Amino acid sequence: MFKHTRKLQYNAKPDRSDPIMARRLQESLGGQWGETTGMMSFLSQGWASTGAEKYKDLLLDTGTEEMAHVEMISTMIGYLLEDAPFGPEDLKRDPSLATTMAGMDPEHSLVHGLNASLNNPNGAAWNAGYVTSSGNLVADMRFNVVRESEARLQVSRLYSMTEDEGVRDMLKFLLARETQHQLQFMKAQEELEEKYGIIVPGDMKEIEHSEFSHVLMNFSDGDGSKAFEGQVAKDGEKFTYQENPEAMGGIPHIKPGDPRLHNHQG
Amino acid sequence: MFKHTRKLQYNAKPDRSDPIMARRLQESLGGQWGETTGMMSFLSQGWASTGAEKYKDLLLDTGTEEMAHVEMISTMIGYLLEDAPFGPEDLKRDPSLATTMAGMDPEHSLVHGLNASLNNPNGAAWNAGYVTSSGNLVADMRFNVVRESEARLQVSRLYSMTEDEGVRDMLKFLLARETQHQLQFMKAQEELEEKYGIIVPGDMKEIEHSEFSHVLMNFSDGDGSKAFEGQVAKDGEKFTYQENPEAMGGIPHIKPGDPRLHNHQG
Amino acid sequence: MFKHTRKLQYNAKPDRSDPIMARRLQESLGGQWGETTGMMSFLSQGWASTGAEKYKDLLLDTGTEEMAHVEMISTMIGYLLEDAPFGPEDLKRDPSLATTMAGMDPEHSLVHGLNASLNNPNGAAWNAGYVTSSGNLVADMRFNVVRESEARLQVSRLYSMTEDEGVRDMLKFLLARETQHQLQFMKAQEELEEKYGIIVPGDMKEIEHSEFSHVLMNFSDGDGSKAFEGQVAKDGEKFTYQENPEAMGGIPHIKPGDPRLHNHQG
Amino acid sequence: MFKHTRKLQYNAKPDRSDPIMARRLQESLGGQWGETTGMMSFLSQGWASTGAEKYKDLLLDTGTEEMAHVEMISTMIGYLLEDAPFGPEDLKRDPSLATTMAGMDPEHSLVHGLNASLNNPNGAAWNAGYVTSSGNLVADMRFNVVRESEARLQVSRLYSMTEDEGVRDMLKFLLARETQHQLQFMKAQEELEEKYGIIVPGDMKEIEHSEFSHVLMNFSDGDGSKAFEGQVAKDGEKFTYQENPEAMGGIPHIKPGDPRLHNHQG
Amino acid sequence: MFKHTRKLQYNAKPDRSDPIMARRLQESLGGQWGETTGMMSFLSQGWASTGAEKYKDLLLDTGTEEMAHVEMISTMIGYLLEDAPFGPEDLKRDPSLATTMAGMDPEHSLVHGLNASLNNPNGAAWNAGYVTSSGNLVADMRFNVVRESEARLQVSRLYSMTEDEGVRDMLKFLLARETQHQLQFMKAQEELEEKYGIIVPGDMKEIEHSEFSHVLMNFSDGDGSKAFEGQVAKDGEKFTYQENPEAMGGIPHIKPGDPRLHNHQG
Amino acid sequence: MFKHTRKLQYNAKPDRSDPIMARRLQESLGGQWGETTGMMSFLSQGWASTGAEKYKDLLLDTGTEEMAHVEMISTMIGYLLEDAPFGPEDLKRDPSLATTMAGMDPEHSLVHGLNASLNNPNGAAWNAGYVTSSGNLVADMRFNVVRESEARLQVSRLYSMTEDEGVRDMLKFLLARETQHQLQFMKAQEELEEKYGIIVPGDMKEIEHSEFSHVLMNFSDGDGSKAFEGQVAKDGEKFTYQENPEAMGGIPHIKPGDPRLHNHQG
Ligand SMILES: [Ca+2]
Ligand SMILES: [Ca+2]
Ligand SMILES: [Ca+2]
Ligand SMILES: [Ca+2]
Ligand SMILES: [Ca+2]
Ligand SMILES: [Ca+2]
Ligand SMILES: [Mn+3]
Ligand SMILES: [Mn+3]
Ligand SMILES: [Mn+3]
Ligand SMILES: [Mn+3]
Ligand SMILES: [Mn+3]
Ligand SMILES: [Mn+3]
Ligand SMILES: [Mn+3]
Ligand SMILES: [Mn+3]
Ligand SMILES: [Mn+3]
Ligand SMILES: [Mn+3]
Ligand SMILES: [Mn+3]
Ligand SMILES: [Mn+3]
Ligand code: NA
Ligand code: NA
Ligand SMILES: [O]
Ligand SMILES: [O]
Ligand SMILES: [O]
Ligand SMILES: [O]
Ligand SMILES: [O]
Ligand SMILES: [O]
């Protein structure tokens, strides 16, 4: 179960309004790699785990934290939308606001009354297709590192998309929390790799066709990738290199379907 | 530019038909972590890179290979759908086929004439929201490892969802290629981390609020995560642990909107 | 069955072109609470009803009217897009048009030839996820009131997003029709509530766990909601108030899955 | 900010496994009117409100409670998926399990390792298009009543879709909470209607074309809706009835577009 | 404007219930090439046209007819869902119904109360991405023929998916209407091609790089397409054939981006 | 299987940067009728064909070619995004860039690091709902002609949306290839129509209700469509015309559902 305090985890107030930045920050709220993705991924993985409490609790700790970040971004967006222009009265006051209006999300005003959406900057709804919870935490801890890496990349970009020190203060906090989250998930990932194996899943080495497991296949005519040849892979075996990959599976010949399908193909 | 040969990269023919397995394999064709996701992610990242040829070429090599896998899965599904039941004539032949029909994707027959879709097993269309190309390859190589990890997990599951040795032959090849792909992307990842930093992006350490960068914050009441306390993180600094995270940001108070918005909130 | 007349239900011509307003009006055409949502919701509900003709006919009447509104908005958008700028030749005759171009939907010209789309202002396609038809008209009449409420709110906002008297004339008609629709659906709702109950569905009072049915649970630390304590709810029973809700369900412990799933969780 | 306890708000454990019921319950987790919709709608409205604390706090209290329900449904699904059949070895044990397998969501096993998804029963991802936060709480409290009405309908149906008394115990709790939520939102709605008006928004009566505001227009040839004629609407004015609605707007003619668009229309 | 009669265009009543067929028929209601696609495509194109009345009226005629077909399919689905099984009481009545339940759409009962949805058989929502209205009727009449072709193919398949004579009666009517619609759109198409050109758009022959306009480029190693070599194309010019297409564009190199983007690519 | 060369099929470098044009060109990369739609449609149809080699090879040839076009558009977008403005430093340098920034896709910088997305200009993800592969090549070749027609229309429009002769050079090549593709698919279509019939599918004429197969039904009150009366349709039979279409199916009456559904409809 959860409980809520009205107090934010950390400052989420800008020095001044900026509806263009509000639109950008929709990426962090409703985007592919945003806080809602973190929240739902870590919570769902956490609820699904039947294994080590170290990792189950880490996931629930972090997913709960991400809910605080969802709250923070939603709040920042609301502040940033204060006094945003949306109609003729605004243009009469200052005709240059047309530029601002053009760069805004039309739905911020029209749909939400100058409040945050749960979409990205382009109005694409957040969706669960952004979430991963597979049941395998070697894989999912890798995913969690990625989530925090792509997110911190975006936050770092956002930092260079404003000069507002209030917005930056919030971003600087999130950068630090994303460092922590990257690191904690990397530690979990490494412990899980040590237990189960470096290849995911770790218990299929005897099943796969081993002859092809360490061959770098040169499908594009650049030769940059030849530099991997002879390097030691993370499992201790060297990469080999195949200059000209071969087509080994023959030409397929699927059977024409039943006439009731009307598959008229010549 | 690309060229195509009709010969498959590797065998993609089953020993017998099975439209239920065809439906499962749609995950590998049109699903979140399937071959189309790999193909489009690695190619888009490859085309976007302005950096080291070692990695640009690796991405284009692999994206091109994934197109061969898309072809293989599409082919396997077509073979698996041969003679699949879809109407009363089939039930006249064998009434027990109603069970098979119930488990099939209705659109395999109706929409596609007993051929593959570009959807997942539940008819959800593949979409570009599954794809990541961020411009940062430290982040994106991590993503690529994840893609290959989730895919290999799914392929491993699929192996236990059939007894068809022809299907399994294809799966065993893909398991191996996914091993190679996981490993090559891990090597690239590690080299990029060595160059730019273990935290993504690596050039923000002096900007983030460092005091919060290594603190494990206990938001859920389990104590499993306390095991991380005092462990050395990948950047060489130890994690600290906060049993009771603090709300430091105050209670927000956003300015009510302009009356033209009709934001009647009491 | 339907028949069509080329005459619009009401005026839908703007006094002047304005492609930015065209973009805003896409909300009323292809948006979540737009006219297409009303049309499809009321017709689907109407076709699904097996109950009182008073309500079935109301739904079909209204859904049919909403098709006229879809036609009007589509028409208005087309007029608003007349002579809109879309390339270098336009800027040559008026360089100030760059600002207009920046705020336009690129697809209005490129995809549709300066005609309406069936997307919202952000380009997100209308979809049936916006539509409700549940089989229960106590629930669905409530939905219908909401549809007309959200729509009228948006129309009211649009009224303040233009000074075009032609656009406003159409909007003033839509405001009035949305008043009628809100009121007719409110009357239907109330009659249905009188027949079936104020709680939806009205025939489960003896099944639910009654002890929790009138308790306001204070999950957020604000005390505003305490003002509901002792107030008489619509079913005639007072609300009680629980300042500190309790977790009553225990800590779950789901069983680890079969090894074939490779659920490596530590 | 939020905090989490591992203890569930209320029991969420079935007496027996049942992966078909697991699939149904996905509606309550990832569906249109499910607990995630509640959680995100109430939290987003709550964060966006600048109005009376009575309602802002109510929203935050309830959105936080709905997170507990998301947790419960996710947990219930996990339990229900225990030991579910997913491959040939299950059929070897009991060939009759083919029926169960046919009815399952293939991704429960393949994608999630026999854990919950964030999709509906058909694998359609939850998305933010299900959420409303408009800025107007007269409209949005109506929405919230709908949310809880449609949800309670679905929970009532679910009660008749199982005989598992553990599942039913959870459902009975949710029915009761949905009663409370329906009622509290209805009270809020009524107080806000008193303050602002029964028509949303309540401050446009002088703007709308009043002649059309209380006319029931008979667009479908059934005569059931004529029963509204003469009834007193909720604003105190009687409905009138128009048996034969008229097309008042003329036949529109948009100008042909610029030749650079190539709008060849004959 | 539109008016509605309760009378269906043509019979849409089955002899018997069949919830599996109901699910199939959702393709015709909510699917990619179904009646809602026809309705919205032909109406949107019709409203958009500024050209010949012959075609504008044809589009509005047919779009209006498609609304009748949306009504028919919606109705047929409702009838087909009568008495459909959805819970333990049905299995007590007839345990063999488990098979039927497994093949049904879970949301038909749970969400819609055994009524139609506006989704396809897999629960994917109808969306406007299925609609085309481009402003060019040479293109769009081609699209309209495709819509009616794909639809008639599906209806033909549906005919072999049931033996119900009532269902078949409806299908036989739809087949015939789809014949008419294919033909009328083909005639419009041809007239428009005669006016504007066989290539769309017809007024760019002097702009394109003509040298590459009639060359069949053999990008895949099969030789079947060489049969086009020397055949006369529809514009009266012969196809030529290139066995080995050439890459003429060079190897691109984009400039590395601003460091504020953190594009760390090696 | 596929192989790749770094060399582009044809020039894809603009003379100069233009991030607004980059946004437009996203229609050709990730849009409904763009190159990814061609690529995936032609390849999937190719892989699914069991019919004449002429057509199967054509589809594989062309789908492979479209992959080169995907590469080209991706590359062109990357070049066009060079030096695009994205933050305060750019505005400090040149305040006039705010107009450009307002018209850009915010995600070009924030998500992709000034590289291409796989979305349309409005950020809507490319999805497989854009792709058709039905199993019937009479229908699908019609679809392929449409794809190339809509694409060539958009490319033609793009030509008038820039003065950059580098961009135009690429567009001029694509116009020519779209001519060839339109023509080759038209030729295939015509051969297939001669083999199977002009109506799709061609083997249903004795099943359909022939009395309705050549009647133009006047559902909209314009009389432009009466011009088709007496014209000879493509199958050799004249169209007839019905001024007043009749509703022949009666008023439906579906049975009220089981009480366990709670279908309270009055
Ligand atoms: Ca290479
Ligand atoms: Ca903890
Ligand atoms: Ca409270
Ligand atoms: Ca009526
Ligand atoms: Ca060839
Ligand atoms: Ca007519
Ligand atoms: Mn965060
Ligand atoms: Mn984080
Ligand atoms: Mn692969
Ligand atoms: Mn791979
Ligand atoms: Mn309306
Ligand atoms: Mn209305
Ligand atoms: Mn709840
Ligand atoms: Mn609730
Ligand atoms: Mn039709
Ligand atoms: Mn038709
Ligand atoms: Mn092309
Ligand atoms: Mn082409
Ligand atoms: Na505000
Ligand atoms: Na019924
Ligand atoms: O975070
Ligand atoms: O792979
Ligand atoms: O309306
Ligand atoms: O709830
Ligand atoms: O049709
Ligand atoms: O093309």
Side-chain angles (χ1 to χ4, degrees), chain B residues 27 163 220-221 262 264-265, chain D residues 4-5 50 92 107 137 203:
Chain B
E27 190 71 51
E163 296 182 305
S220 181
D221 66 359
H262 308 276
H264 299 161
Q265 299 168 354
Chain D
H4 178 253
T5 176
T50 65
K92 284 187 187 173
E107 296 191 315
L137 293 183
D203 63 337

Side-chain angles (χ1 to χ4, degrees), chain F residues 24-31 33-36 73 154-155 158:
Chain F
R24 296 189 186 91
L25 280 161
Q26 289 284 172
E27 190 70 50
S28 296
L29 180 48
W33 293 115
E35 304 304 81
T36 304
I73 304 299
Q154 292 176 2
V155 170
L158 294 163

